[PDB]
């Protein structure tokens, strides 16, 4: 059981930009999500503070980065707070629409698309370097489910049947086909190293076969 959700026009229209928008400093969307996943790890360690059995469903708190050529994919894993369904729904938990408005108002004044973040829209800048982008997430509250957009002014959310995650959220990129730099094991490194070198969580690079 499949919904078919249509993007405010306004978030619609910050995709087609960072889609169409020709910037070659593609590689930031890997900052962007780390940066996300940290922010969803310090919310559920607060929470913890004052009700530990907010851990139950996991103590340990991380980042993932799984590479795999295979598919074309890289994923961004994080055992962070989760979200609900209707988090998913409003944007993924985000203000994206007063995010969106600020953002691009800093464009026509000077800004760059390397500054998304400041805006609290960081997390569309995967469509920089994906052609279609899956979120399976678990908040403690809700169920696990999975979101999905190729863009084209729609997503979908269904209840994930996959592998149970017991806490955070799962990123899955899949990569346009001439952005599979971002598979390469030495590439995401220089990344992480230059962009992330300060993330309080550990970041663990997945290898491969
Ligand atoms: C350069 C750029 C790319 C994508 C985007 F969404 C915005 C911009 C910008 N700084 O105007």
């Given at each position: 059981?499949?919904?078919?959700?249509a993007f405010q026009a306004e978030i619609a229209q910050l995709m087609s930009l960072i889609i169409n928008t020709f910037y070659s400093n593609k590689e930031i969307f890997l900052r962007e999500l780390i940066?996300?996943?940290?922010?969803?790890?310090?919310?559920?360690?607060?929470?913890?503070?004052?009700?530990?059995?907010?851990?139950?469903?996991?103590?340990?708190?991380?980042?993932?980065?799984?590479?795999?050529?295979?598919?074309?994919?890289?994923?961004?894993?994080?055992?962070?707070?989760?979200?609900?369904?209707?988090?998913?729904?409003?944007?993924?938990?985000?203000?994206?629409?007063?995010?969106?408005?600020?953002?691009?108002?800093?464009?026509?004044?000077?800004?760059?698309?390397?500054?998304?973040?400041?805006?609290?829209?960081?997390?569309?800048?995967?469509?920089?370097?994906?052609?279609?982008?899956?979120?399976?997430?678990?908040?403690?509250?809700?169920?696990?489910?999975?979101?999905?957009?190729?863009?084209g002014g729609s997503f979908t959310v269904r209840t994930d049947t996959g592998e149970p995650m017991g806490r955070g959220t799962k990123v899955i990129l899949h990569l346009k086909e001439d952005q599979t730099?971002?598979?390469?094991?030495?590439?995401?490194?220089?990344?992480?190293?230059?962009?992330?070198?300060?993330?309080?969580?550990?970041?663990?690079?997945?290898?491969?076969?």
């Open positions: 059981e499949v919904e078919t959700f940066s996300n996943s940290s922010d969803a790890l310090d919310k559920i360690r607060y929470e913890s503070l004052t009700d530990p059995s907010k851990l139950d469903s996991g103590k340990e708190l991380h980042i993932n980065l799984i590479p795999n050529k295979q598919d074309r994919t890289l994923t961004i894993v994080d055992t962070g707070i989760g979200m609900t369904k209707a988090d998913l729904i409003n944007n993924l938990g985000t203000i994206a629409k007063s995010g969106t408005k600020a953002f691009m108002e800093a464009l026509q004044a000077g800004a760059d698309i390397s500054m998304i973040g400041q805006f609290g829209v960081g997390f569309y800048s995967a469509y920089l370097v994906a052609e279609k982008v899956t979120v399976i997430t678990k908040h403690n509250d809700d169920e696990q489910y999975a979101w999905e957009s190729s863009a730099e971002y598979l390469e094991e030495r590439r995401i490194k220089e990344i992480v190293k230059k962009h992330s070198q300060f993330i309080g969580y550990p970041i663990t690079l997945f290898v491969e076969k």
